[PDB]
Amino acid sequence: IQLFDRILLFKPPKYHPDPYVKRVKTWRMHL
User: Which residues point to the Cytoplasmic side?
Assistant: First the structure.
């Protein structure tokens, strides 16, 4: 379930977001 770029831990009960902290995840992916 990570088809965000190529198209457009726990589970959150308040929202149904098809990940809270990406501010520094994608940046480290290019390293």
Answer: 1-31
